[PDB]
Amino acid sequence: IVVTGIPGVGKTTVMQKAAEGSPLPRVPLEGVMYGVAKRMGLVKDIDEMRRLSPDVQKEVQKKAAERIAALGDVILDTHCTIKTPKGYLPGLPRWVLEKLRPSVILLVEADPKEIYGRRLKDDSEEEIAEHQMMNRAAAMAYASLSGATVKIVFNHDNRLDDAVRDAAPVL
Amino acid sequence: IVVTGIPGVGKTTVMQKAAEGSPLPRVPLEGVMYGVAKRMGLVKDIDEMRRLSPDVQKEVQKKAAERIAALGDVILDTHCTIKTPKGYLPGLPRWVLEKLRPSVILLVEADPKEIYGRRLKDDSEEEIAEHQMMNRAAAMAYASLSGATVKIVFNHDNRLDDAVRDAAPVL
Amino acid sequence: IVVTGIPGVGKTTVMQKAAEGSPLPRVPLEGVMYGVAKRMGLVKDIDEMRRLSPDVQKEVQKKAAERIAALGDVILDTHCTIKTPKGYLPGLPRWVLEKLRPSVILLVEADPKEIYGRRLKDDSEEEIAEHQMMNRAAAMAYASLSGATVKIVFNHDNRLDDAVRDAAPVL
Amino acid sequence: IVVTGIPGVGKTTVMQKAAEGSPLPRVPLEGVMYGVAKRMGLVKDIDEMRRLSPDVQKEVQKKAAERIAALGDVILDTHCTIKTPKGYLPGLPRWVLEKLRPSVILLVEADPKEIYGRRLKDDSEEEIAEHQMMNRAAAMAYASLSGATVKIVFNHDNRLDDAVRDAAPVL
Amino acid sequence: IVVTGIPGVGKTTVMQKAAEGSPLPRVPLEGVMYGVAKRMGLVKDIDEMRRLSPDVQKEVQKKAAERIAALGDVILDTHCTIKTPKGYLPGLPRWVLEKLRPSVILLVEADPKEIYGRRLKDDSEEEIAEHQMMNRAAAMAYASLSGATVKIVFNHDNRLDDAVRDAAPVL
Amino acid sequence: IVVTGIPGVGKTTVMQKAAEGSPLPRVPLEGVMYGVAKRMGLVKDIDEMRRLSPDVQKEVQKKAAERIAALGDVILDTHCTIKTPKGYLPGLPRWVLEKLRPSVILLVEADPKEIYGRRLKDDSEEEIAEHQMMNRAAAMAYASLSGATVKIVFNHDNRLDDAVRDAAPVL
């Protein structure tokens, strides 16, 4: 399983509540990549992951995915697209999907005005709505490459029980 | 050619009225998969297609696609995404497209309020509008994998002649 | 399965109604032969099928039948005898039957006066009655060559429900 | 880099203003395909590129992409989807992406009412908004296949400096 | 890392609070064993893990530990001793330690009267104090076999901030 | 095609106007050399091209020319002679011409008094007239080595339409 969401949507809260009583392991993909790179001796510190040569970083992604595939059924956590100075970056290249072979991609959503409120209490609502629409396109592209199912989960501010009630049927 | 649409959009009516006088054979993909599985002795009854092992079901899709490719130019019929308890399932995995190599994907649409009306006379309008948006994303992803052209056809309740007039130029 | 009938008997209507909700593919044999010849590069236009050398046309029939046999169980559609300036031409030679191996030949019939009325609103009644008798002889010859069953279906003008009720038991 | 947009969005103006003082070469992809086909002796005139056999045209796309990859870092120019009588055609098939391996896809946008105004001074606003949405789906599918980043640039009528200020950070 | 504790000591709470913001993956060992056995086809349901042949269960433990060792630095979770009708069962046999090679064993403790209070609000205090003493012996035996460090963390009812302040320095 | 001119003659403006709507790629030679050296890992920044060993810089010129020759018909851009502290440097050595095999060298000119006016608004008129004469000698030497044609184009201050009308016939 892969769980995904825009920064501010409350991804970790819904995942922690829905995964309660589950026998499934819980895995941040960036953490595994750092662990694999560190045990291969390529890095020592978490920021060095951004300094690696891109074509070495492809093989770190490949090896991390092979090892998560060997672990078996898992709640993997990462962004589906990351916003950057040069625009949106796909969080899951084809060479990851060919190794992981996900059964489900789960996408968490809330209203742009709710997310803007949460972010202000910590982009325009138009840029939030854009990043959400780009995530839907990215998820369905990942699905078509892999045979993975795509689930959308709403997580409105007052209504965490709805997000958990929609998420738990997937597990 | 592949023809696709959401349940209730009137797909079969537009397909048969546009295919009138065409030399092209017509084919339901699920029906051919059942036929191939049955002639390979893997099943006897239509429900058993849901009971097959997924990694056998991949090869049944592959063989059905190879045989529909050997038949040549055809009006193939299937859903582009199927709604399920775990969310949207891609109806055409990459291993189907690499065998069929479609020249066109045709997508049928109507207003969510019309579709809700037809369904009530037999999901919310928002979930209908979502499933349409997910189908557009799926179709263009399938196109990029294959070189297939993508055509959208409107099929408003009274206006079947517009749908048929838009469809016939494709054939 | 093969469905057959004299021009004007309403062949397509009875097939379309009885095949409703069937998982079977729906194939015109002339269309397959054109598709096979076109993809073998032998022709580009449908009228060129009448211009092919007869011993090439035998192999086009043979290859079309092999590919329909690979597709498996199907509602195939063609005439059992075609009327021509030199008289009746058999629609299905032995080299087709040895490949398709049909389980059923279905023959649609109506009164010569009904057929003459339909044709007048679009041959003598004696020539219509002759062509029907020649079709029965052709069907039973095909049966004896192949082990196929032969079914006769009446389709009187008002009584389409009787034609469909006789046809549906075959499917 | 690849730069893309709908006809009327002002693609060339934003490209040439942002590329001012850049050491990067600029390349029209259709122009290179014509050049490669012409130097391979396949054509003499630009219109003959539409007359080529599709499976030859795949190899021309492949060879043009290999040569543009060997040139190195470049501002490549083409449409991401081309509107045709049979609907939208993908501008960049997978066999192009596996050769070019783009670092960025850039997508230029403007309001449908602005584009309709420019086109009227030279589709409905609904069909313009549709073609833009189909381009977003195409770009993100291309991204997932390649690891390319996706940037969106607004180019409103009076506001060319905003388009150039968004574009220059990519180069 | 391995985190361990007696049922009712609040193990999961202190782990969740201390692991906050860590890049380390989180793994229940029983979950991995079920996943490995399920993917090896040995079982389908979680209760069948108790029905396996003991010498198969040794090899499942061995394979699960090899796959966790390949994943690298991790917050592993399991009991150090499990209470059963036949008395205490060691949670981590030598064939697990030779694969995992832990750097730390972490042992969570609370007063027998606090644990009795938590268990009532849902063994004698003597049997609780015995099970704690047997865990200390088990942990220090595991340490001597492996070179792992052993840390004890108090988790008194109101004082969760002390438990988290002691746990976070280990990570 | 190669376009050439003295700094201040307005080379880019005449090229940009004449090449309007051309299918030809547009290429700065210094940019390609930097791109080739950068992708060979020899440099990271544009100024390091002056720091290269001359006998490496020859092979970079050779490889850049081979890759621009593989690209086919092109509007290449560079100076025909570069003024330096040690005098005039030839912009195109024999080892470049043997690879590019130009069909045309185009040389842009204006009155030394006009150029001095432009350079004042941004050498003596005698030194400007000298650099032009040295460019004519260099161009005709390049022609004799290669079989390239030589075209001279005037670009007087107001008369850009005359310059573009002389340039466009070459393309």
Residue numbers in the entry:
A (entry chain h), B (entry chain k), C (entry chain r), D (entry chain o), E (entry chain d), F (entry chain w): 1 to 122, 130 to 178
Copy out sentences from the published article reporting this entry, exactly as the authors wrote them.
Of the 359 identified thermophilic trimer homologs, 191 yielded high-confidence AF2 predictions [predicted aligned error (pAE) < 5, predicted local distance difference test (pLDDT) > 90]. We docked these predicted structures in the so-called “I3” architecture by aligning their threefold symmetry axes to the corresponding axes of icosahedral point group symmetry, using the Rosetta SymDofMover to sample the translational and rotational degrees of freedom along this shared axis [Fig. 1C, (27)].
Icosahedral 3D reconstructions at 2.5 Å, 2.3 Å, and 3.5 Å resolution were obtained for I3-A6, I3-D12, and I3-A7, respectively, allowing us to build atomic models of each nanoparticle. Comparing the experimental cryo-EM structures to the computational design models demonstrated that AF2 structure prediction was quite accurate: The all-atom rmsd for a single monomer of I3-A6, I3-D12, and I3-A7 were 1.3 Å, 1.7 Å, and 1.4 Å, respectively. In each case, the rotameric states of the interdigitated hydrophobic side chains at the designed interfaces corresponded well with the design models, as did the polar residues lining the periphery of the I3-A6 and I3-D12 interfaces. Several of the polar residues at the I3-A7 interface adopted unintended rotamers, likely due to small shifts in the backbones of the loops that make up the interface.
